[PDB]
Every structure is written in C-alpha cells, then in structure tokens.
C-alpha cells in the first residue's frame, strides 16, 4: 500500500535530476558549437 507512495518520490527525484542534466547538456553543446564556429574560420 505504501509502496506507491514511496515509489513516487524516486520518480520525481529522478525526473528532477534528468531535467538538471538537460540544462548542463544543452549548455555544453552550445559551448562546443561556439568553439567550432569560431575555430573553423581562424585561417
């Protein structure tokens, strides 16, 4: 009966963690895009 109650927190916590990873990932990819664009035409 209480299993459901306890499961929910792990789902929400995990979901929150995933959301945080999304912010880091989109930020790192923007950094790599910027360095690619700037370095491509240094010649």
């Amino acid at each position: 009966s209480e299993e459901r109650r306890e499961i929910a927190e792990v789902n929400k916590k995990l979901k929150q963690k995933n959301q945080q990873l999304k912010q880091i990932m989109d930020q790192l990819r923007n950094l790599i895009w910027d360095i690619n664009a700037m370095l491509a035409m240094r010649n």
Binding site: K17, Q20, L21, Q23, I24, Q27, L28, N30, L31, D34, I35, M38, L39, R42
Partner: protein, 58 residues
Amino acid sequence: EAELSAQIRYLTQVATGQPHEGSSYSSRKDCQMALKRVDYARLKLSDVARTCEQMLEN
C-alpha cells in the same frame, strides 16, 4: 674625433631620405584574436562548472 668621423661616414652610406613603410601589425591582430578566443572558452567552462556543482549537492 676618430670615432665620430667614422660614424658620420657610416651614416653617409646608409641614408636615403624615405620613411621605410614596413610594419608588423597583422600578426599582432591575429594573436590578440586568439587570446580572446581562449578567454571565451574559459568563461563558458566556469559556467558549466557551477551548474554541475549545484546539481551534485542535494
């Protein structure tokens, strides 16, 4: 007097009366560009560092 007279002769063989329009500006622009590119990199890295830092801590 010997040294000064010799120096005047040397100048009499090296003087042309023109402004000498060589210079070294381009390579200096290129190097400055590269330094600010590295600075950009350092800024973005610090920002990623802090967001990872705040996620690891709950």
